[PDB]
Amino acid sequence: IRREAAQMQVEYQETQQAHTQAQLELLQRKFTNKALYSWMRGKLSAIYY
């Protein structure tokens, strides 16, 4: 029974690993992602100049 509980803990850690993967991908598919911000201040920096 202890071995079963320890095995479920491994599955718990694997689930947590997949959860952070989904968070990171959602951050990249965001509308206000890194690419949008980079081009917006890039365009505005040239205009400000």
Partner 1 sequence: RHNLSIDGQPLSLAIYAEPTDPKALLTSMVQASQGGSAVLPGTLSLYRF
Which residues form the interface with partner 1 (CB under 8 A)?
21, 24-25, 28, 33-35
CB of 3 or CB of 29, closer to partner 1? 29
Q: At its nearest, how many Å lie between partner 1 and the CB of residue 38?
A: 11
d(CA 13, CA 36): 33
Q: At its nearest, how many Å lie between partner 1 and the CB of residue 42?
A: 14
With the CA atoms of 41, 42, 47 and 49 taken in that order, what torsion angle do they form, in degrees rounded to the nearest 10?
Answer: 100
Could you tell me if 39 and 33 are in contact, meaning their C-beta atoms sit under 8 angstroms apart? no
Q: At its nearest, how many Å lie between partner 1 and the CB of residue 25?
A: 4
